[model samples]
Target: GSSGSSGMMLGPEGGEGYVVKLRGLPWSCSIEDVQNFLSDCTIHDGVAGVHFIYTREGRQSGEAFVELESEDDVKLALKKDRESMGHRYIEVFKSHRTEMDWVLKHSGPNSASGPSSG
Candidate 1:
């Protein structure tokens, strides 16, 4: 029922969505920060979820992924890309999806791959 008849580069026939990568989130930051970020544009739209990744190296935790419920929300959020939150200036853009193999390959044998752990 939404207007625009253009097909996305991803070849999807639905409203726009985005995978936003954020920086400067201290280990102290919670999912609440992400929820607030999307709350403004999410009115009548949606915000799928937020994901944080812990990499193989570095003591400092880094990187995050924010998936908006609709592509329109991504567009709207991008309009305010350079806004500041606390001391951190937030950046927004299209994000690439990570492969399942990346995590599977990196996790140690002792690590619990699923919810039920040893």
Candidate 2:
């Protein structure tokens, strides 16, 4: 039996997965940019995926969520923290699905508690 440890993290759904949040990205950036940025790291089975968010005006929000294959890779991804893509430096931090869920649930125009009026 070649069953070995997969090294994946237990996700919010109680599954084997984890997420990384990337901020200060160029609005024109795409999944390709993220892939190339983390090219130095090993992404198991090339399972990395990007969930880009948009502003209320339907423009890129300069933020993204990356679904990494292993929990270790999440830390590895941090090596590029504050790294630059184009001109603006990006910020990388460990994140969870629940955080993204809260953003989606509260930041919509129809939501009662939208962005602060201040």
Best by TM-score: 2
lDDT of 1 by residue, 84-112 (tens): 66567666655634532243234324334
Q: Clash pairs of candidate 1?
A: 16-70, 16-71, 17-71
For candidate 2, the per-residue lDDT at 116 reads: 68
- Tens-place lDDT digits, model 2, residues 1-118: 7443444556534333466778999978988887777776554445346666666556777787777666677778888899998778888888765576565554443555654683
- After superposing candidate 1 on the true structure, give the runs of residues whose Cα lies further than 4 Å from its correct spot: 1-17, 43-48, 57-60, 96-118
Q: lDDT of all predictions, in order shown?
A: 0.55, 0.69
- Ten contiguous residues minimizing lDDT sum, candidate 1: 99-108
Where is model 2 more than 4 Å wrong at Cα?
Answer: 1-16, 42-48, 101-118
Worst 10 residues of 2 by lDDT: 7-16
Cα misplacement distance, residue 83 of candidate 2 (Å): 0.4
| Candidate 1 local Cα displacement, residue 77, angstroms | 1.8
